[PDB]
Symmetry: none
Subunit: 144 residues, 12 copies
């Protein structure tokens, strides 16, 4: 129905496309990052924030895919289809969840405006030719 | 972790399981109902309510599930595998998404308290023996 | 180019699609009701309401279509072609006029908000599985 | 030339045309209903209301119709022709008189606005296809 | 039961019986006069007068009788029965309609009291023996 | 039911018939003018004016007629029958729509009184002999 | 002397004839109801009500009729004449006394303004075709 | 069950039994007496008096008895039964109606207390031995 | 001594005869209802009500009758006489106790005036012919 | 299920059992006393006192017992069976009814406290040895 | 000795004995209704109300009954004795538990007074002979 | 629904598990103690206490098991299965009822807090090795 996941938060798919595909961390590291920082808030019966509301659904609909992978592992005695299904899952659908989890965790940790301006800064950094590219890339931190 | 989709809204998975599994409408037409009534709100760049965010996420991830089903049906070669994968997907991952869509659309249309009361009322009505239950099943209406 | 007959009033084609195709009455009954209830309204030189101009235009368009049907039935040499033309006319082009006449007549009789609420309620009713839907269906009436 | 009986009363011919032929009671029932409900008013000399003037003429004309029917039956020699004449005079022209008597009696008993709105609601109900209409028809009683 | 056609108009059946049966004009002439004088008032959607209210019903019932006659003449195949039925219809059933139409049209045109007095004045003239009966019968006129 | 399209706007069919049948422009040109001048108001969810509703209905009806013509040309098998049907359509059911579109578009562009007076002025100018009239026909302009 | 029973109470013979002839209860049941409900009032030396007076007179004359029937049954010899006399008595003179007793007892029990309206209501309900009337027949109740 | 027609008015059967059986006038004479004096009052829609109500009921039930007599005279095969039924009727059941009509008519005409006093006086007159009985019996009159 | 059980309360035997014999429930059900609703008031040393006073005596003399039945069962070696005795007891002496218990229990539960009105209404209901009798009979209840 | 006849009146079964069984009078004498002293109050439609209700109920159910005795004496065929039934009746069901009737009649005649004290006085007098007691037994008197 | 289960609640055993055996829903249905409507109150360490303690005790003892049933079924060797034992367990001890659960749940849902009057009305209805009783039963909802 | 029998009373199933399974007295002695001390309060129609409320239900649902055992022993014709069934009943289903009865009777008699402290003191006594365990086990007394 032409729904943009980040439009209600202020970004677009094109804006989030400034970062390369290899930039985003793994699903596992993001999940431990979430569970070590907002486990008591993603498990409480309150409308803490739309970021929390989106993170809950993202985690659940990723767990659905993990359960599907377990089911196709336990059934479908054809090894070729076994390998193809799981490979397609954790390669062509893990990227979207990585982007969503990274956005919703970085926003909650640092600031929506901070993340929004970091995206522009990183796009500017990555657009320049490598010869004139400065050695250090922009990074999100709260220390000097 | 351990997250309940309806706990932040006021319900639980067990409370939605009170109703029979063959009562909820089709996911094929629930999206049509949502698109014919809330498209302007769902495309808007604004937080309208906590219901809208969950509706958007559910619609998007179901669309991705349909994309996965299409990819399987296009790229796989074993008819048996193309049968089990699709059947599992749009039975097991379809029932709970039907429940989610019904809950959120009903909460947006009639009201959270009304839906919560209707759930309990229908659950109690169904279990009453037919010779004593009121003849007409409960229904949600706006008129 | 992208104009529908219901956006200016409050409804839409998809919203009006909640009712099944065969729900609407025939054309003769709708015309009889329109005449017997609002002839004086649709004879005066006044814009009583936007619901009246659309009714006038729809009635005139249906009259033109009926004149076309009479002409093709009278002045053609191929009975088969005559039959296909008339059948297509009163099978396909009559449904849209049925929907338009029903919408405008019901609005003028009961209220635009009442019609919208009835549409939503009937969509909810028809969406229910038959094993659980109540026997009686929603209807528009003023009696108790 | 196209005089209709209900325009002055606020209804129209096609508005009352939606009711089924079996919705109206018999003439022999509608006449006794009037005779038992409003008789002192129908015999009194004052114009009680415009609903009484339209009723007296209809009653007298139906009496004329019965007189014609019995005259035909008594003084026709062709049995088949007598059968068709009596059947026509008791079936085709009975429906209009039943409609008139029902309309006037129901108006006098229930008010005019109530009868008109009941007619509108009944038309709405009857135009609905049976697959979607509610099982029972709208009612008008006290 | 025993309803007087002329009682709400200050008259009675036997009072109107003073005039001979040949005095009343024909249905065609009476209907032409009505349609030429009060057509726009008879077709009005308002209660102009009880006279109009009665005239409308009388005209409609005469139309029904004409439809009956046409149906008999067309459908009925026996010429003798056809002729007998039509002769009876527009010989006997038309006289009362002629009286009613004449009464209501005259009361609409000249006046109820004028017609009431005219009936008595005509009775006086018709009772007189021919030797002393004036050769000019009473007439209705507006001068 | 004997309804006149222009009667609520202030004109009649006979008033628009005053001008010659060849004066009005083509349906394609009128639709292009409408699309290039009032699309943002014709596609708006508001009652801008009574002219806009009639314009919308006329455009939709013409689209339906064009769809009917396309269906006839696609499905009919007799070239002669296709010729008669299509030519009838865009020769006789087209002139009335040209008049309607011209009237409504000119009204929206210039004002109802200006368009109403222009009809009479142009007709009277055409009726007079050439030797006793201004040499150039009247024109509607905004400058 | 052309006297009506119910004309001093507010009804007529024709109005009571509106109801079916097989609706009124039996004479025995009516007498038992009267004896068990109003014996003290009927056996009192005071004008309790015109209903009481009429009830007393009707009961006394019905007792006289029963005494006549017993005398006929005792003294007559041929069975046929006794049969017709008795059957005529407790059919024809029984129906009207049933109507009288029902009217007076129902009045004394419920109210004249209620019994009068019940007659009209029941008659109109019975005349109505079954498919367009309430399914339950009207009944007089005290609770 | 044990109801008499005179207790509500002030008399009893025994008190009315002071007069001999052959004293009361005929049913016909009583009926013309009623019709010539209270015809307009016996047809009014008003409760003029309990006397009026009782007279109405008595007249109507005597009419029922007369109709029964006509029916038995018109439809019965046996002369013996035909004669016996009417002979019993207008001899045994007519006396009670004679007494009732006389009582009510005399009351309405003269006064209930006057009628009671007349009954009391006539008892004394009739019980006196014939030798000492005065020549003239008491009579109801309004003139001297 | 010509004593009526219900005269002191307001009803009469003929008035209580409106209900048929089959209407009243059994004796066991009435005793269970009494012992479940008013046991602590029937076993108390206070004049709570004349209804209680009558109920106590009725229950006691019914218990006496039951003791008589047990005694005649134990003795009276003749099975025929035993059978006639018990049959007479619990067929003809039980109906009166059923009526008494029903009357007193229904009065104590609902109200004396309500019971009287119900009796009158049920008499009216049962009097009418079956063809016109409404399908539902009057009943005593405190719920709609 | 455990109700005492005299508990509401202030006595017990064991208190009435204090007196000898042969002291109480006969049912016939007690009924004659009741009929000759309180018939006009026992026939009244009013609650005179709680004693009257108990007297009415006791008299009624004793009359029913006598009716049962008559029925068994009439219908039974074995003289021995009739003997046992009737003797059991008017001895065992008779003694307690004599006690009840005596208690209620004496109460109504003399006052509740007098009858209550008389029982104890008479019992203690009887249990006392003759040589150390008043020579004559106590008696209830109204003089 | 004689402890009436409902005496402390304003009710009485023969009062609840008039209801037919088909009036009460299944044990599974009643337990599901309880676990889906009052679970938060039934899991808390508070007392809440005297209507909760009896519900907890009944649920626990019924769980014991289920454990006994599955035990007998597993560790009984005679194929015939198990039939009678299990049928008795889920038929004769089922009715009393259904009565208790229905009483407590209906009280907690509708108020004690309403349920108390409904029992009297239903007893009056059920004691009427069929030839005179109304066609449909009195209703609590 | 995973309902703790002792949660509204400030206890826990694990906490009451400190006592050995042989510590609790027998059902007959516990019922005799209850009937000799709180009979007129358990048979009262009032909510004396939640302890009384629970004790009533415990007694009733034990009486149901006694009736079940009697029915089994009087109806089941197999003498091999009769033993097994009754032995299972009053060897396994009696222990939990004994624990419940002991807990509620002790809490009614001595006090909830006193019983709670006694449960901890008994555990402290029972954990001690035999060499240093005192020969006098803790007891409840007033």
């Amino acid at each position: 129905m032409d729904i943009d996941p980040y439009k209600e938060f202020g970004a677009t798919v094109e804006l989030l496309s400034f970062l390369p595909s290899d930039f985003f961390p793994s699903v596992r590291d993001l999940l431990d990052t979430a569970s070590a920082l907002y486990r008591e808030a993603l498990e409480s019966p309150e409308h803490c924030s739309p970021h929390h509301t989106a993170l809950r659904q993202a985690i659940l609909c990723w767990g659905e895919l993990m359960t599907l992978a377990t089911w196709v592992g336990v059934n479908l005695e054809d090894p070729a289809s076994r390998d193809l299904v799981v490979s397609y899952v954790n390669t062509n659908m893990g990227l979207k969840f990585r982007q969503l989890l990274w956005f919703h965790i970085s926003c909650l940790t640092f600031g929506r405006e901070t993340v929004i301006e970091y995206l522009v800064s990183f796009g500017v950094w990555i657009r320049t030719p490598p010869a004139y590219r400065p050695p250090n890339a922009p990074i999100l931190s709260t220390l000097p």
